[PDB]
Design a protein around this ligand. Structure first.
Ligand SMILES: [Mg+2]
Ligand SMILES: [Mg+2]
Length: 1196
RNA sequence: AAUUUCUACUAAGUGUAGAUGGAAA
């Protein structure tokens, strides 16, 4: 049989639809008469205004609660913080977090908050007219309620004002208290508390307000601003201009050796993209010469001009990629400080033992990550002698602000306020890109200086630096908000997706659908022939649909009808115990008591007989209930098979749906449209057309099978459909046209037909140049799933009873975009091809489509376009569509082969400089991938068939997070692809040796670590046998014995082509060696010049090098292995390229793909070792040692 | 150079192929 035969009735899915609503008859004229546009347009307009009023009264509410609660744990907290044990402090910090959570939530009203009542009465106390108009429209603000209930939880996020008031502000407060205790000797009694307090408040002393017992009092924003008035100063309502205490420390530069830390301010809490001239004006206003941005930049200039004068111990930079970046900047290469730290740390932890284990490696990397921040002193230690790296980075930011000065001096001409913008933003792209150069210069500077924090939480620190540092940084951070705002106004389309929902004076509109409650819902899907429509009714004619007949007038319609049934588990005890049924039934007192206790629910109170008699009471009460017994010919299953109540809840849930058609008539309700008493919109797409012949949307098929009589098992709508309204963006006159009868030269270079001539004009994007109606319809999938199991485990069960599991290998290549391989469950490769060309199996002749040549044209355009954001979004979404094509090809291969799917993990993965497909692109790839695999249906089949819309394939769980993709989602496998590109598949061979030349002594020991170097004249080759245990870090090998050989040729990057043996022999004849008397390793060691051994190191690098690519031409990018097979031949890619189906791979792409296949093959081999109850606990992530053993042994 | 929307087209001439889950910040 097949292996896809279990992945149906597993779990639910919710989605929606989006469709065109075509006005039919007098409907557009009638809404134009009755003026149903301006009011919800105005409602959408002042929805932001009343939102702002809600924020205003929310600040009123929290300021009302901001006077009451007093805290106690602060007294021990300030001591255990300030006393220079952190797990105990964190355990008490949990108590602090709980106490402030209680102080936030459990007090002071806290009731009429996110309901109807607040906007119904409280905010009334347009503005009153606006709230009256906004009544009963709370659904428009439910999202605001969910958005605005965020501040009171335990989230510790930016939303959390408890985190915001404690975790930074109290800490900075106590540190400022202690700094005040440090510098209180310079504070004079005439200045710092007499004039300032007796002007500001005349309240209690500043030596009172430096106590921890006043932070609870100054928890308000008034305390925040009076704190920052102590720091900096205040206008004080006149021209008095009071001083600040930080300014007193500033004027304590009279000793010219200040060395005092400042005071940190407090964090309080709580726009653009309209016009081009507007955003350029706000750009100039944010970025002018006397702007706060500019002056903070100048502050950084003076600060980091005199940066060399402070504490090297008290300065810190964090961990990240930027430390490797600054390794490249200071010393020249990438991981230099990294392996310097390994050189120290392995002197510490590594003993005199030579081998480094894998656990040593991963825990060493874990320690490297765990040290999240660094003072400069160990960095100077890893630096060599006479290297002021602080002066080095000082000169780096000096030349960075020099280039900033350069872009200023070349770009200030737009800041001429008298100069006017002449053309559009889409026209003056030169100065647009100039502005872009400004912003990316600032962005590169902030990412470069972004390491200069240390994220501490640290020891003693130059806070005299760090306070002014974060003072400049708070101004200079929101440049990103400015950046992506103006990037958005760059990247926006010529149109927009602006839309506004319409209610027609009905808050009870479009929620329920199937039930006879359309006097409130007032809308119903209609059909004639195969053409589907939407009919909407007025309040005065809500029961217009009663007087409808079939009546055989040769005009007939199809009224959607029956009863959906939502929420049965909550609906049934309500309707059966609301006294409208207590009065109709007896009711039985024993089952009333059993329900009001709960002895049928699970949780060690459950009795199966009590549950079953509750079910049979539900049976007889439902069969006696008229509105459900006369709507469903009820046929449940038998009583004794019911294990619980939730299963029968799903049975009544599936039996609460019978949607089909009433036979209506046509002409009288078209007349009711014409009289204005019917509102009438045609459900529309492109595939509703008369011209519709090809392959429509799967979503349209979904819509059809809402009314397929055989879809009882079961796909059906979700209630609560919406309808928005999209006006025009551009004008129909103002479009550029390709005319009737005109030879229009085609764009695809793959069709032999190159020019199109057709007999009607087409416009510029006509659907976007007019005012159109858009319906939005939700859809339900698998509400009552039958086959429930644990997914990945049952996959492993199928693999346990497998005989020969086929597998898809999935990887991006270098000159290839994507590559897919077919391999069996015994490592025998079946099929392989790249996916650069993309073919459609379509009615007449199949035609391929290459995205690769497209991307080459786009990179050419971006080279002659100076990398504008238009090109960036261009190539990004070209990738985004391309991968959507890829995954359709993927799942087509899945339904062909019933295979298993494995991909490069990025939770530990890396990228190597060549594949165009990004981490973000690949992330989008896998997310759309797992979404497509969350339900899999071929359109072309019978929808009722296995694979069709009834019986498709839910093979995976829903997406959780980017970090959640952890080695498995069922058939999905997030693979550590370490050491998987440069790898011999034909034998199982890899180099482990670092071939960068270090020393001549290193060269000589590298020679003598080999045991035999022998020229052979039979093959005209060179024998290179070796033991890996005479080499460092070769622990993962299993064979370790390899006679390397050297025929063929390779490519120097420089591209440059070199053949191996000729290069060897010319070096040996130039340095004077009879090479025909091996072994001569001591004779190689006998040389002394640097040139021979460096060139020899280079030649050895060529020998171990396997991949060559010319990187400009698609063809000549080849591979070559140095070690023969089990029968005496090795593998080159040029000897297996021109093939159709061989056992070999074809390139590095197929190599890595075959690697993936062998990883999951080993995973199945592990599954063939343990018990079925243990397969969940089976560790999955293969390591290098058993990986190479698998590679060397299963190679046969 | 058309589209419920997105991508590549122009497929036999008002579309073709695919992907396509929205409201909320
Ligand atoms: Mg189609
Ligand atoms: Mg397009």
């Amino acid at each position: 049989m097949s292996k896809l035969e279990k992945f149906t009735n597993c779990y639910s899915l919710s989605k929606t639809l989006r469709f065109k609503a075509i006005p039919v008859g007098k409907t557009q004229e009638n809404i134009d008469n009755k003026r149903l546009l301006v009011e919800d347009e105005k409602r959408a307009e002042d929805y932001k205004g009343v939102k702002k009023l809600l924020d205003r009264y929310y600040l009123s509410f929290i300021n009302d609660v901001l006077h009451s609660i007093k805290l106690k744990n602060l007294n021990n907290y300030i001591s255990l913080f300030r006393k220079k044990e952190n797990k105990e402090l964190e355990n008490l910090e949990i108590n602090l977090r709980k106490e402030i959570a209680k102080a936030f939530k459990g007090n002071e009203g806290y009731k009429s908050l996110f309901k109807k009542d607040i906007i119904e009465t409280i905010l009334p106390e347009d503005e009153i007219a606006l709230v009256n108009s906004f009544n009963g429209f709370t659904t428009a603000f439910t999202g605001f309620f969910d958005n605005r209930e965020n501040m009171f939880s335990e989230e510790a996020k930016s939303t959390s004002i408890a985190f915001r008031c404690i975790n930074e502000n109290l800490t900075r407060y106590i540190s400022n208290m202690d700094i005040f205790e440090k510098v209180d000797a310079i504070f004079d009694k005439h200045e710092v508390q007499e004039i300032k307090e007796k002007i500001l408040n005349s309240d209690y002393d500043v030596e009172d307000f430096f106590e921890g017992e006043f932070f609870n009092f100054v928890l308000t924003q008034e305390g925040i601003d009076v704190y920052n008035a102590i720091i900096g100063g205040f206008v004080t309502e006149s021209g008095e201009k009071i001083k600040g205490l930080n300014e007193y420390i500033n004027l304590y530069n009279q000793k010219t050796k200040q060395k005092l830390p400042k005071f940190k301010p407090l964090y309080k809490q709580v726009e653009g993209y309209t016009s081009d001239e507007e955003v350029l004006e706000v750009f100039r206003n944010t970025l002018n010469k006397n702007s706060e941005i500019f002056s903070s930049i100048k502050k950084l200039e003076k600060l980091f001009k005199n940066f060399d004068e402070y504490s090297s111990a008290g300065i810190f930079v964090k961990n990240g990629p930027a430390i490797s970046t600054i390794s490249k900047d200071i010393f020249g290469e990438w991981n230099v400080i990294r392996d310097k730290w390994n050189a120290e740390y392995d002197d510490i932890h590594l003993k005199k033992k030579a081998v480094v284990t894998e656990k040593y490696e991963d825990d060493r990397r874990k320690s490297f990550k765990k040290i999240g921040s660094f003072s400069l002193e160990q960095l100077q230690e890893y630096a060599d002698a006479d290297l002021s790296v602080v002066e080095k980075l000082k000169e780096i930011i000096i030349q960075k602000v020099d280039e900033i000065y350069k872009v200023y001096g070349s770009s200030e001409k737009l800041f001429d306020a008298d100069f006017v913008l002449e053309k559009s933003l889409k026209k003056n792209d030169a100065v647009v890109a100039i502005m872009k150069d400004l912003l990316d210069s600032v962005k590169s500077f902030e990412n470069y200086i972004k390491a200069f924090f240390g994220e501490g939480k640290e020891t003693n620190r130059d806070e005299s630096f760090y306070g002014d540092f974060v003072l400049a940084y708070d101004i200079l951070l929101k440049v990103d908000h400015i950046y992506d705002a103006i990037r958005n106004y760059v990247t926006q389309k010529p149109y927009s997706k602006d839309k506004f929902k319409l209610y027609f004076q009905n808050p009870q509109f479009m929620g329920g659908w199937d039930k006879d409650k359309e006097t409130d819902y007032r809308a119903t899907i209609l059909r004639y022939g195969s053409k589907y429509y939407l009919a909407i009714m007025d309040k005065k004619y809500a029961k217009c649909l009663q007087k409808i007949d079939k009546d055989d007038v040769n005009g007939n319609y199809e009224k959607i009808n029956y009863k959906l049934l939502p929420g049965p588990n909550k609906m049934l005890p309500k309707v059966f115990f609301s006294k409208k049924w207590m009065a109709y039934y007896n009711p039985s007192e024993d089952i009333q008591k059993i329900y009001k206790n709960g002895t049928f629910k699970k949780g060690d109170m459950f009795n199966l007989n009590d549950c079953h008699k509750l079910i049979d009471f539900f049976k007889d009460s439902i069969s006696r209930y008229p509105k459900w017994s006369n709507a469903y010919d009820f046929n449940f299953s038998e009583t004794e098979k019911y294990k619980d109540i939730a299963g029968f809840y799903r049975e009544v849930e599936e039996q609460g749906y019978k949607v089909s058609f009433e036979s209506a008539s046509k002409k009288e309700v078209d007349k009711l449209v014409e009289e204005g008493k019917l509102y009438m919109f045609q459900i529309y797409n492109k595939d509703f057309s008369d011209k519709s012949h090809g392959t429509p949307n799967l979503h349209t098929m979904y819509f059809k099978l809402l009314f397929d009589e055989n879809n009882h098992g079961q796909i059906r709508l979700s209630g609560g459909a919406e309808l928005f309204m999209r006006r025009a963006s551009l004008k129909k006159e103002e479009l550029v046209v390709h005319p009737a009868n005109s030879p229009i030269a085609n764009k695809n270079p793959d069709n032999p037909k190159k020019t199109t001539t057709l007999s009607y004009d087409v416009y510029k994007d006509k659907r976007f140049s007019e005012d159109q109606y858009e319906l939005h319809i939700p859809i339900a999938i698998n509400k009552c799933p039958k086959n429930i199991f644990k997914i990945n485990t049952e996959v492993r069960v199928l693999l346990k009873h497998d005989d020969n599991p086929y597998v898809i290998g999935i990887d991006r290549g270098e000159r290839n975009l994507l590559y897919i391989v077919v391999v069996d469950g015994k490592g025998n490769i079946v099929e392989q091809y790249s996916l650069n060309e993309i073919i459609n199996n379509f009615n007449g002749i199949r035609i391929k489509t290459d995205y690769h040549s497209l991307l080459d044209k786009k990179e050419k355009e971006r080279f002659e376009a100076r990398q504008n954001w238009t090109s960036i979004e261009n190539i990004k979404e070209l990738k985004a569509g391309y991968i959507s094509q890829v995954v359709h090809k993927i799942c087509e291969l899945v339904e062909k082969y019933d295979a298993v799917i494995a991909l490069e993990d990025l939770n530990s993965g890396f990228k190597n400089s060549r594949v165009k497909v990004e981490k973000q692109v690949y992330q989008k790839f896998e997310k759309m991938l797992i979404d497509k695999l969350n339900y899999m249906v071929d359109k072309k089949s019978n929808p009722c068939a296995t694979g069709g819309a009834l019986k498709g394939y839910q093979i995976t769980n829903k997406f959780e997070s980017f970090k959640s993709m952890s080695t498995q989602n069922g058939f999905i496998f997030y693979i550590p692809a370490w050491l998987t590109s440069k790898i011999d598949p034909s034998t199982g061979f890899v180099n482990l040796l670092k071939t960068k030349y270090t020393s001549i002594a290193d060269s000589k020991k590298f020679i003598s670590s080999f045991d035999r170097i022998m020229y052979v004249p039979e093959e005209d080759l060179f024998e290179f046998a070796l033991d890996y245990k005479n080499f460092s870090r070769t622990d993962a090998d299993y064979i370790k014995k390899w006679k390397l050989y050297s025929y063929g040729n390779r490519i120097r990057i420089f591209w440059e082509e070199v053949c191996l043996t000729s290069a060897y022999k010319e070096l040996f004849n130039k340095y004077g060696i009879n090479y025909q008397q091996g072994d001569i390793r001591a004779l190689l060691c006998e040389q002394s010049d640097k040139a021979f051994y460096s060139s020899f190191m280079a030649l050895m690098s060529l020998m171990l090098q396997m991949r060559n690519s010319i990187t400009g031409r698609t063809d000549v990018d080849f591979l070559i292995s140095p070690v023969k097979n089990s029968d005496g031949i090795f593998y080159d890619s040029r000897n297996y390229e021109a093939q159709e189906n061989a056992i070999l791979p074809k390139n590095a792409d197929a190599n890595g793909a075959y690697n993936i296949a062998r990883k999951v093959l080993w995973a199945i081999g592990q599954f063939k070792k343990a018990e079925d109850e243990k397969l969940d606990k089976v560790k999955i992530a293969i390591s290098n040692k058993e990986w190479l053993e698998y590679a060397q042994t299963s190679v046969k």
